[PDB]
């Protein structure tokens, strides 16, 4: 661990590392849930795991998927307070971009903006990074289906598909094997329902033990709108193969 | 361009006696041809046996009286409820008026009370703070009608020193009655505040036009 | 480990495991407060507080332990009294501003989000301290009845039943039993009786206590937040005393 | 951070009482308005305050007009052991009776005198302020202030407001051990002139000629007083002041 | 008040060394290898792409950035600091030079601006030094081609050929044995590919390494025609197909 | 919710209104020598004959920022403007570079002006003062 | 930024072209005259008035010449920085927004009146921009002291289906009418053609 | 020992969840002398025992007048007492000036709580360390409030604060029904207060020098008796 | 503002033995165009106070917002807001007059004339006037604009001094107000036939009558 300083603020250790950033990274696995993001031909699908062990909770109020703009959706890995803080700031960023430049904010530009803010947090002494990982999904009017991920260190990158959580390695390996088999960097289907079913199947075979309709959360981005599915829609998708 | 000033047309008079002071004013508030109100006092008891009047633009006079009363409240708070003397009040009012040197109050101010020897005292202020102690001061419309009437019956040089309070009240009433007869802005009532060692007493007399 | 040495002297510091120990210490401060519960019925909410008796010198009507944030929003809290008062004032300001701007009472989730963001902003800098209070609030809006619980970390959730304070374990067990025994739902009067019973059962610590209950229901109070009159409170107390003995 | 929260938490704005200056001027928070060594002057919050003030200062009620100091003759000179200051006390009557005689010369200190010759309020206010400044300086330095320093303070102050609307011409007369007897003239334009003989008034050429006819450095006190009185009488009863190292002495009609 | 200041985060150790700058240099030395080679007709700048997972699209994130049409840069160290400094350099090229003189700055002056920005971070009360090292290649009319290296402390030096990162010493020796005054741009590209071949542990193909050149003007990249005096950009980033073709040859 | 800046005129004046440059001999009067403005510039001259657009240009960005904060307060709550102001204040307070006047990179990122240029950026711009110690005294409040 | 020094001093001392834009089925054309006048005197008989905000976004201005040049250059710098930041081709709407907000900030004290044409991944765009910050869309626009003759020519022979050649001819004819019938215009005709999916073609001294 | 590590400032919780600086500020009240407050349906009174530095010194002022209808008494630090009394005076003055309205006692208590809570959650300052007893008469009748510097205000019929105030509080509890009904007789209420404060005396006797009294009521403006004015109540 | 655009004409008010009566017409005029019909210019503030405003309509709506904010802030957080801690007419008038004078001193006045009418908690009648200059006064009869020259001489016939107040019933005062409104509709070119009236009585409370029309108009003397 940090010897002297580096236990409070973000300055270099003798090894050239930033311990507070790494600890913020470790803070992202507190919720112990997983999320997956895949691209279709004209849609992008994000599927997140719901865990509600408490019987006194209202399940409809538990969600880690947020709507940022008309076309952009976001999934957060980490504690829900920093998740909501990040969601509000992302909404403000997208709206201000639209006001200032006359056209809708693309997913990758928003990811870069959030990453620059994270860089601010990693360099300033009196600011702490947010212990969350952000994944933005959309169907950009130029780049087509898009998935971009940002982390507490300020690093962001785009993905053909991605997975994040305590069990991200298994899902990543399964996706890599599937893409080796199919030799296509996306899913060849004409409707987002088939893509959602494929993502559910991938999640089931990776995590194991399956789930019901109340243990899952699905968001789908098309060229016009990003929308979150309800419990009945997820039940229909589970029933339909 | 917006004009922030106005005129309300009153008449005030302050007289210093041997052991008393008198401040009187007409109670009619008008807007240049119309009667806004027939009873609107302009002479106010400010505490510590000090009476004040600010004749002219009514909003400015109300603001000045409000500020002076609040300042007197803080003076009592900060100095163990010490009585504010008339000369100290005059200096406070001078500072209050000169604080608006480049945006002045459009008023003529008169204050009355008793000095540290118990004798009557009246102070008159110019609109930007210049002030002096006087035996008798008439201000506003019809002052040119009121001062000669007083000088015709009083030797300020019966001498004013030996006059009683009732005689002064009667003389003020007579001068205001004559001014009401001769001037279209004077009338509808006269209010007189008298300051003596026993405090402040109020008198009201109806004038013409009801 | 409950005590993180070297990482528990500043507010906005991550531990090597990714934990914030000052927020957890505020949580421990919350866990010592008085027991408070909230129950959500078919068309409203009920709040119950285990008040501790005090000297007779207190004016009886000027010391109430259930705060009215707005005509449709009521809340209780456990922890530090000044922090609870501050958060209630912030909630009242937010509700008033929303009603002024949008000419309608603020929906409960929007109020919860604003309060949660305000609480979360106090875990970001070393010049402030996390709130030492946990709050159970709720009410009725156009979408129905809502009950929420908010924690010092800024985390909040909607609940079927919520409990906080010293007697939180027994109260939570009773709330779970009540939820299990009524899959269909619950009514406001049954909710009041069960709230009295749960407050009475949770008490375990030589000191006499009184009870406060509060309603907010569409059928009973026309969607407004009200206290309990003599008759209903006495009936609930009788039911609770029968339950205990 | 909590102050920031208070700034964004929702009557006071319309009253303009969120500004500390407005609260101080109305005596809400205390009597700090009467505690400023440098007084605060209200200015109209418009593009042309000077034009506004000039237009509104020349328009009906005689009692609401700014009082102007008498343009009557004022004389000052320094003969051998002090300063003779002479004014004419022929006051002008109006709609008032004076309890006692007025004075055309302001007594700044027991050792300093000034003359009005301009706007009465400006001269009275700023010479009282100058007396306060001189008192504070003398307390600090444990020595009487030089006349040059006091005149320079007044000149700097009036120059800071040059063109705003002030009008004042004053003659600062003093006597110190290091300087001797000194007379300065300070104007609202920022002028500051040291001199031996000053004559400012309606008719001052006659008084200046009478002085120059019979002026010498070897005048005595009685001779100097007589010469000043005669010069004032030639100009146009007469108030006299004799300033020496120990202060000023006032003569009613000597 | 005690918040009107904040003590310096970078201080001298008793030996006379600034510890934070040394730790930033260590962080640089833990980074991926990048190199630059200066020839007679151009400059080659190269680096190794890295990926957290194979599912990442390596083309979205580029370690090679155009600062001006005639100036490009590459890195070793921490990526977000790179992004911040590149945005700042692109802005400064316009605010300080092009809006004043109507032309883009020379290579050395832009390097100086970047180095000043980096130095100001080592004398501060609330930012740590940038933990990154810079390679800037460029061309200008009165100086020809140039290659510079910028350190976290803000010191910059011109190089005929150099490398930074994890495999910097071996790459430096290999470039020392393989440089001369009469090298050409194609020879420099081949030498750069050979040098990078010794540092990449995984797949050495066109989708895992990144190259760019400062060479001759490319009028086909201007986007408009009609002005004979308007020179095209001299900065050009080689595509993956071109890198694969050069590797096969 | 202001677009054009409003309430830009002074309402009061005094000879000690500039706390940075006050005479030590007469603390109620300003120090003309250390002002270094030509020596013949009374404060009154600054109250008249200004270009009408100068106040609009000088306060433009602050006005837009305040409108944005007001919109955030109306739509998001108190916490959002509070956090934005806290971030900006921390960044501004931790920066002290007496030898340079340029804004920081992080300030530009927070202001969302990473790739924006205005005439203030292009045009950023004695016997006494203009030294490091004057800036130290002004920054520390001593 | 821009200074206000010596404003009072200057007051004290005092007290003592044809431009057209046309739209065709696959792009836009912008044309201008080449006469520069410092009053009644012809300063330059061949002066370029078509200015480049970006390689495929061009503009031509009237009003205060220094203001037009400075505003165009500043918006070009902003557009270049934004395009680098987003790694995307600049759009005409972005330049329009930047110009509109910059002109609205200065409350009409910057005397630049512009015609802005361009192509981008969303298509072809033509806009008019006023010095006070108002903008408008059109299919054909004219500007300058010769704008009425040019607009008469445009109203004579404009239709929805126009090829590149017809659009170039029509713009050239409008500039020619401005040249012949207006004293401020004359000399040569400069053209710039932008098509969807091609490089911009800048033809200096097209007809003469 | 473990408390010694977590009591540096007011932005630190101990591992058990305790804010020790606020507790110390609360403990600072015991260093001040005893004050008693009580009221009935018509009048409210305060009684204070004053202390002197020595024989040659004067006695400390324990009762401060805020407005013609409201006042308070202090127990604890002098600077915080001065600050809070001036703040209450400013608030009353603002109410009177802006609305021509008398500031309510409940409003004053809420304002004091709001001002006191701020210093207990932000770094750079300290919590207040004075308890206050506030009496007033307004449109809702007579009011007595107890302000604790943690940021708490309670409304009571009677109370006492300061060193050894438990005896006076016990006496007030025992005889609540007696003095709660003393309407229209100020002297009886004042004597009840004096008897209540007599329970807190230890080797001390009330004199004309160390006793201060204050009263407010329906027709009685807030009035302070000192010196011989209290000789009749001894 | 610096010049009114949409305006209302006149408000007239009178004291009687047990309360006050106030009235104003429903019209917002756009220059000489009678543009808006249906503008309520009497604002009830609580159950004991009515405020009548004439002049600029946007400034009037701003004043309405201020009054609503004042009412809402009264209940924050007094539980006795409906009890003895309710707002008094004098409080409202003091606040409004302070605002008007402060904005006059700011060279940004609210171009309005305001009458506050109501009953104090002790049963006294309150009737006060303040304008854009901050000039305030009281009288048994009050009016703004054209009413101040036409309606006031009529009403002063009924209540000429303070001793006439106890002799004046509510019926007589309402009849006088209605007749004055009819005269105003006769001789004011910016007037409306539709008006609203409000009675504040210390016994019966607040009665707010809307959609009142001038009736019994003599037009038959044409020739």
Curated annotation (Swiss-Prot), chain A:
Keywords: Acetylation, Cytoplasm, Isopeptide bond, Nucleus, Phosphoprotein, Proteasome, Ubl conjugation. GO terms for biological process: proteasomal ubiquitin-independent protein catabolic process; proteasome-mediated ubiquitin-dependent protein catabolic process. It comes from Saccharomyces cerevisiae (strain ATCC 204508 / S288c). Belongs to the peptidase T1A family. Its main location: cytoplasm. It is found in: Cytoplasm; Nucleus. PANTHER family: PROTEASOME SUBUNIT ALPHA/BETA. Pfam families: Proteasome (PF00227), Proteasome_A_N (PF10584). GO terms for cellular component: mitochondrion; nucleus; proteasome complex; proteasome core complex, alpha-subunit complex. The gene is SCL1. There is a cross-link at residue 225 (Glycyl lysine isopeptide (Lys-Gly) (interchain with G-Cter in ubiquitin)). Present with 15200 molecules/cell in log phase SD medium. The keyword Iron-sulfur does not apply. The 26S proteasome consists of a 20S proteasome core and two 19S regulatory subunits. The 20S proteasome core is composed of 28 subunits that are arranged in four stacked rings, resulting in a barrel-shaped structure. The two end rings are each formed by seven alpha subunits, and the two central rings are each formed by seven beta subunits. The catalytic chamber with the active sites is on the inside of the barrel. Interacts with CIC1. SUPFAM superfamilies: N-terminal nucleophile aminohydrolases (Ntn hydrolases). The modification Phosphoserine is found at residue 230. This is Proteasome subunit alpha type-1. Gene3D superfamilies: Glutamine Phosphoribosylpyrophosphate, subunit 1, domain 1. Disulfide bonds: none annotated.
From Swiss-Prot, chain B:
Keywords: Cytoplasm, Nucleus, Proteasome. It is found in: Cytoplasm; Nucleus. GO terms for cellular component: cytosol; nucleus; proteasome complex; proteasome core complex, beta-subunit complex. SUPFAM superfamilies: N-terminal nucleophile aminohydrolases (Ntn hydrolases). It comes from the Eukaryota. Pfam families: Proteasome. One of its GO terms (biological process) is proteasomal ubiquitin-independent protein catabolic process. Non-catalytic component of the proteasome which degrades poly-ubiquitinated proteins in the cytoplasm and in the nucleus. It is essential for the regulated turnover of proteins and for the removal of misfolded proteins. The proteasome is a multicatalytic proteinase complex that is characterized by its ability to cleave peptides with Arg, Phe, Tyr, Leu, and Glu adjacent to the leaving group at neutral or slightly basic pH. It has an ATP-dependent proteolytic activity. The 26S proteasome consists of a 20S proteasome core and two 19S regulatory subunits. The 20S proteasome core is composed of 28 subunits that are arranged in four stacked rings, resulting in a barrel-shaped structure. The two end rings are each formed by seven alpha subunits, and the two central rings are each formed by seven beta subunits. The catalytic chamber with the active sites is on the inside of the barrel. Belongs to the peptidase T1B family. This is Proteasome subunit beta type-6.
Swiss-Prot record, chain F:
One of its GO terms (cellular component) is nucleus. Residues 1-35 are annotated as: Disordered. One of its GO terms (biological process) is ubiquitin-dependent protein catabolic process. Seems to be degraded by the proteasome upon its formation. Keywords: Chaperone. InterPro entries: Ump1 (IPR008012). The keyword Chaperone applies. Present with 2740 molecules/cell in log phase SD medium. Belongs to the POMP/UMP1 family. Short-lived chaperone present in the precursor form of the 20S proteasome and absent in the mature complex. Required for the correct assembly and enzymatic activation of the proteasome. Also prevents premature processing of the PRE2 propeptide. This is Proteasome maturation factor UMP1.
UniProtKB/Swiss-Prot annotation, chain I:
GO terms for biological process: proteasomal ubiquitin-independent protein catabolic process; proteasome assembly; proteasome-mediated ubiquitin-dependent protein catabolic process. Non-catalytic component of the proteasome which degrades poly-ubiquitinated proteins in the cytoplasm and in the nucleus. It is essential for the regulated turnover of proteins and for the removal of misfolded proteins. The proteasome is a multicatalytic proteinase complex that is characterized by its ability to cleave peptides with Arg, Phe, Tyr, Leu, and Glu adjacent to the leaving group at neutral or slightly basic pH. It has an ATP-dependent proteolytic activity. PRE3 and PRE4 are necessary for the peptidyl-glutamyl-peptide-hydrolyzing activity. The 26S proteasome consists of a 20S proteasome core and two 19S regulatory subunits. The 20S proteasome core is composed of 28 subunits that are arranged in four stacked rings, resulting in a barrel-shaped structure. The two end rings are each formed by seven alpha subunits, and the two central rings are each formed by seven beta subunits. The catalytic chamber with the active sites is on the inside of the barrel. Interacts with CIC1. This is Proteasome subunit beta type-7. Keywords: Cytoplasm, Nucleus, Proteasome. It is found in: Cytoplasm; Nucleus. Its main location: cytoplasm. It comes from the Eukaryota.
């Amino acid at each position: 661990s940090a010897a002297g300083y580096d236990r409070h603020i973000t300055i270099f250790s003798p090894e050239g590392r930033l311990y507070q950033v790494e600890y913020a990274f470790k803070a992202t696995n507190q919720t112990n849930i997983n999320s997956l993001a895949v691209r279709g031909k004209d849609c992008t699908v994000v599927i997140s795991q719901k865990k509600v062990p408490d019987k006194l909770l209202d399940p409809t109020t538990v969600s880690y998927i947020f709507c940022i703009s008309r076309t952009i959706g976001m999934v957060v890995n980490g504690p829900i307070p920093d998740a909501r803080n990040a969601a509000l700031r992302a909404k403000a960023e997208a709206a201000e971009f639209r006001y200032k430049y006359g056209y809708d904010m693309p997913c990758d530009v928003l990811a870069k903006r959030m990453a620059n803010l994270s860089q601010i947090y990693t360099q300033r002494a009196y600011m702490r990074p947010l212990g969350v990982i952000l994944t933005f999904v959309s169907v950009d009017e130029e780049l087509g289906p898009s998935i971009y991920k940002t982390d507490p260190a300020g690093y962001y990158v785009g993905y053909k598909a991605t997975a994040t959580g305590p069990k991200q390695q298994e899902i990543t390996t399964n996706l890599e094997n599937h893409f080796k088999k199919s030799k296509i960097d996306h899913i060849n289907e004409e409707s987002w329902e088939k893509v959602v079913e494929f993502a559910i199947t991938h999640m089931i075979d990776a995590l194991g033990t399956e789930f019901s309709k109340n243990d899952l959360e699905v968001g789908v981005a098309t060229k016009d709108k990003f929308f979150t599915l309800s419990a009945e829609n997820i039940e229909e998708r589970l029933v339909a193969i | 361009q917006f004009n922030p000033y106005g005129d309300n047309g009153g008449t005030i008079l302050g007289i210093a006696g041997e052991d008393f002071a008198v401040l009187a004013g007409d109670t009619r508030n008008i807007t240049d041809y119309s009667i806004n109100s027939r009873y609107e006092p302009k002479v106010f008891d400010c505490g510590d046996n000090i009476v004040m009047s600010a004749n002219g633009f009514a909003a400015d006079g109300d603001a000045l009286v409000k500020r002076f009363k609040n300042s007197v409240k803080w003076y009592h708070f900060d100095h163990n409820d010490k009585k504010l003397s008339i000369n100290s009040a005059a200096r406070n009012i001078q500072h209050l008026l000169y604080g608006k040197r480049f945006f002045p109050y459009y008023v003529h101010t008169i204050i009355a009370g008793l000095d540290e020897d118990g004798k009557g005292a009246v102070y008159s202020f110019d609109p930007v703070g210049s002030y002096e102690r006087e035996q008798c001061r008439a201000g506003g419309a019809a002052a040119s009608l009121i001062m000669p009437f007083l000088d015709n019956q009083v030797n300020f040089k019966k001498p004013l020193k030996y006059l009683s309070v009732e005689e002064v009240i009667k003389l003020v009433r007579d001068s205001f009655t004559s001014a009401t007869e001769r001037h279209i802005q004077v009338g509808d009532g006269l209010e007189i505040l008298i300051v003596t060692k026993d405090g402040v007493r109020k008198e009201f007399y109806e004038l013409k036009r009801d | 480990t409950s005590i993180g040495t070297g990482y528990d002297l500043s507010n906005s510091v991550f531990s090597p495991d990714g934990r914030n120990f000052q927020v957890e210490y505020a949580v421990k401060a919350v866990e010592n407060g008085t027991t408070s519960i909230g129950i959500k019925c078919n068309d409203g909410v009920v709040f119950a507080v285990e008040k501790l008796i005090t000297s007779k010198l207190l004016v009886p009507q000027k010391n109430v332990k259930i705060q009215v944030v707005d005509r449709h929003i009521g809340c209780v809290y456990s922890g530090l009294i000044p922090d609870g008062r501050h958060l209630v004032n912030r909630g009242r300001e937010e509700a008033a501003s929303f009603k002024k701007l949008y000419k309608t009472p603020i929906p409960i989730p929007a109020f919860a989000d604003r309060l949660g963001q305000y609480v979360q902003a106090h875990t970001l800098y070393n010049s402030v301290r996390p709130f030492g209070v946990s709050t159970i609030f709720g009410g009725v809006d156009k979408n129905g009845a809502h009950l929420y619980m908010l924690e010092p970390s800024g985390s909040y959730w909607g609940y079927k039943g919520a409990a906080t304070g010293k007697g939180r374990q027994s109260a939570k067990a009773e709330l779970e039993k009540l939820v299990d025994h009524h899959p269909e739902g619950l009514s406001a009067r049954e909710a009041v009786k069960q709230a009295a019973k749960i407050i009475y059962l949770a008490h375990e610590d030589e000191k006499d206590f009184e009870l406060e209950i509060s309603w907010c229901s569409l059928s009973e109070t026309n969607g407004l937040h009200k206290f309990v009159k003599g008759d209903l409170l006495q009936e609930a107390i009788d039911f609770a005393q029968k339950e205990i003995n | 951070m909590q102050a920031i929260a208070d700034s964004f938490s929702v009557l006071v704005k319309e009253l303009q009482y969120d500004n500390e200056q407005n609260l101080e001027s109305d005596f809400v928070t205390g009597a700090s308005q009467f505690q400023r060594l440098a007084p605060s002057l209200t200015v109209p919050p418009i593009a042309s305050p000077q034009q506004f003030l000039r237009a509104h200062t020349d328009d009906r009620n005689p009692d609401c007009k700014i009082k102007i100091a008498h343009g009557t003759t004022t004389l000052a000179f320094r003969f051998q052991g002090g300063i003779i200051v002479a004014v004419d006390s022929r006051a002008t009557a109006g709609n008032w009776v004076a309890s006692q005689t007025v004075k055309k010369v302001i007594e700044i200190n027991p050792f300093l005198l000034g003359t009005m010759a301009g706007g009465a309020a400006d001269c009275q206010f700023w010479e009282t302020w100058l007396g306060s400044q001189c008192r504070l300086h003398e307390l600090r330095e444990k020595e009487r202030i030089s006349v040059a320093a006091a005149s320079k303070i007044l000149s700097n102050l009036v120059y800071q407001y040059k063109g705003a609307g002030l009008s004042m011409g004053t003659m600062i007369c003093g006597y110190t051990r290091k300087e001797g007897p000194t007379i300065y003239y300070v104007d609202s334009d920022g002028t500051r002139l040291k001199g031996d003989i000053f004559c400012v008034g309606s008719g001052q050429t006659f008084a200046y000629g009478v002085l120059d006819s019979n002026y010498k450095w070897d005048l005595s006190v009685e001779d100097a007083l007589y010469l000043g009185k005669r010069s004032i009488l030639a100009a146009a009863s007469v108030n006299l002041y004799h300033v020496t190292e120990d202060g000023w002495i006032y003569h009613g009609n000597h | 008040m005690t918040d009107r200041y904040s003590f310096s985060l970078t201080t001298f150790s008793p030996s006379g060394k600034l510890g934070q700058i040394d730790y930033a240099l260590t962080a640089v030395k833990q980074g991926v290898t990048s190199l630059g080679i200066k020839a007679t007709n151009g400059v080659v700048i190269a680096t190794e792409k890295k990926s957290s997972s194979p599912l990442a699209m390596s083309e979205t994130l580029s370690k090679v950035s155009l600062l001006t049409p005639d100036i490009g840069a590459v890195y070793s160290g921490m990526g977000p600091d790179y992004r911040v400094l590149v945005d700042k350099s692109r802005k400064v090229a316009h605010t300080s030079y092009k809006r004043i003189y109507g032309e883009y700055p020379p290579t050395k002056l832009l390097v100086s601006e970047v180095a000043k920005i980096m130095q100001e971070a080592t004398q501060s009360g609330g930012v740590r030094p940038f933990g990154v090292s810079l390679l800037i290649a460029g061309h200008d009319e009165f100086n020809g081609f140039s290659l510079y290296q910028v350190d976290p402390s803000g010191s910059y030096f011109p190089w005929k050929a150099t490398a930074i990162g994890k495999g910097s010493v071996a790459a430096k020796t290999f470039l020392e044995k393989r440089w001369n005054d009469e090298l050409e741009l194609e020879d420099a590209i081949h030498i750069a590919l050979l040098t990078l071949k010794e540092s990449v542990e995984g797949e050495f193909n066109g989708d895992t390494i990144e190259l760019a050149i400062i060479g001759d003007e490319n009028p086909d990249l201007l986007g408009y025609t009609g002005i004979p005096t308007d020179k095209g950009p001299r900065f050009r980033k080689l595509t993956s197909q071109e890198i694969n073709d050069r590797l096969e040859a | 919710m202001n677009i054009v800046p409003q309430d830009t005129f002074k309402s009061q004046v005094s000879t000690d209104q500039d706390k940075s440059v006050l005479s030590s001999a007469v603390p109620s009067l300003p120090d003309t020598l250390r002002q270094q403005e030509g020596g013949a510039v009374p404060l009154s001259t600054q109250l008249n004959d200004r270009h009408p657009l100068e106040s609009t240009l000088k306060n433009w960005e602050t006005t837009q920022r305040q409108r944005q904060m007001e919109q955030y307060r109306q739509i998001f709550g108190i916490a959002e403007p509070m956090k934005r102001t806290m971030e900006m204040e921390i960044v501004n307070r931790t920066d002290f570079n007496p030898l340079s006047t340029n804004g920081s990179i992080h300030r530009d990122i927070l202001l969302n002006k990473e790739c924006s240029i205005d005439w203030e950026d292009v045009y950023p711009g004695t016997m006494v003062g203009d030294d490091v110690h004057s800036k130290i005294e002004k920054q520390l409040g001593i | 930024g821009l200074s206000f020094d010596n404003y009072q001093r200057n007051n004290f001392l005092a007290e003592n072209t044809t431009i057209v834009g046309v739209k065709f089925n696959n792009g836009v054309v912008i044309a201008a005259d080449t006469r520069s006048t410092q009053g009644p005197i012809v300063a330059d008989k061949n002066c370029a008035k078509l200015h480049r905000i970006s390689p495929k976004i061009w503009c031509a201005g009237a009003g205060t010449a220094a203001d037009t040049e400075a505003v165009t250059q500043l918006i070009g710098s902003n557009i270049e920085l934004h395009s680098l930041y987003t790694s995307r081709e600049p759009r005409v709407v972005s330049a329009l927004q930047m110009l509109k907000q910059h002109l609205f900030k200065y409350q009409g004290h910057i005397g630049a009146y512009l015609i802005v044409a361009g192509v981008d991944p969303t298509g072809s765009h033509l806009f008019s921009i006023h010095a006070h910050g108002s903008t408008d869309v059109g299919y054909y626009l004219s500007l300058g002291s010769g704008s009425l003759a040019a607009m008469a020519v445009l109203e004579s022979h404009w239709k929805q289906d126009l090829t590149k050649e017809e659009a170039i001819k029509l713009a050239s004819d409008a500039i020619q009418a401005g040249i012949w019938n207006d004293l401020g215009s004359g000399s040569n005709v400069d053209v710039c053609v932008m098509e969807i999916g091609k490089d911009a073609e800048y033809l200096r001294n097209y007809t003469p | 020992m473990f408390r010694n590590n977590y009591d540096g400032d007011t932005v630190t919780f101990s591992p058990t969840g305790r804010l020790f600086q606020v507790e110390y500020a609360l403990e600072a009240i015991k260093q001040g002398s005893v004050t008693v407050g009580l009221r009935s349906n018509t009048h409210a009174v305060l009684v204070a025992l004053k202390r002197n530095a020595d024989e040659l010194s004067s006695y400390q002022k324990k009762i401060i007048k805020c407005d013609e209808h409201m006042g308070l008494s202090l127990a604890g630090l002098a600077p915080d007492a001065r600050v809070l009394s001036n703040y209450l005076r400013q608030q009353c003055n603002y109410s009177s000036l802006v609305f021509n309205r008398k500031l309510a006692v409940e409003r004053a208590g809420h304002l004091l709580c709001d001002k006191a809570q701020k210093n207990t959650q932000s770094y750079g300052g300290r919590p207040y360390g004075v308890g206050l007893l506030i009496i007033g008469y307004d449109k809702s009748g007579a009011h007595l409030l107890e302000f604790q510097p943690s940021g708490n205000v309670t409304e009571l019929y009677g109370t006492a604060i300061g060193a050894r105030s438990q005896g006076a509080k016990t006496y007030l509890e025992r005889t609540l029904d007696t003095f709660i009904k003393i309407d229209g007789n100020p002297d009886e209420l004042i004597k009840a207060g004096v008897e209540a404060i007599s329970q807190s005396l230890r080797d001390e006797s009330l004199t004309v020098d160390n006793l201060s009294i204050a009263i407010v009521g329906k027709d009685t403006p807030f009035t302070i008796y000192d010196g011989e004015a209290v000789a009749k109540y001894i | 503002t610096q010049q009114p655009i949409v305006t209302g004409t006149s408000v007239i008010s009178m004291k009687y033995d047990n309360g006050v009566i106030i009235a104003a017409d429903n019209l917002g005029s756009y220059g000489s165009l009678l543009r808006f019909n249906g503008v309520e210019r009497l604002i009830p503030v609580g159950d004991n106070t009515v405020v009548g405003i004439s002049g600029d309509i946007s400034d009037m709506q701003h004043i309405e917002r201020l009054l609503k904010d004042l009412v809402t802030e009264n209940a924050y957080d007094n539980p006795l807001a409906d009890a003895e801690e309710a707002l008094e007419p004098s409080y409202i008038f003091e606040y409004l007059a302070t605002v008007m004078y402060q904005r006059r001193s700011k060279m940004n006045p609210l171009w309005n004339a305001i009458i506050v009418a109501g009953v104090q908690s002790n049963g006294d009648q309150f009737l006060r006037y303040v304008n854009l200059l901050g000039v305030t006064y009281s009288s048994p009869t009050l009016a703004t604009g054209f009413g101040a020259h036409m309606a006031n001489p009529l009403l002063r016939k009924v209540v000429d001094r303070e001793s006439d107040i106890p002799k004046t019933t509510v019926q007589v005062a309402e009849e006088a107000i209605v007749n004055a409104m009819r005269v105003l509709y006769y001789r004011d070119a910016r007037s409306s036939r539709n008006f609203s009236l409000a009675i504040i009585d210390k016994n019966t409370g607040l009665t707010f009558k809307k959609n009142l029309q001038v009736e019994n108009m003599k037009w038959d003397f044409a020739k």
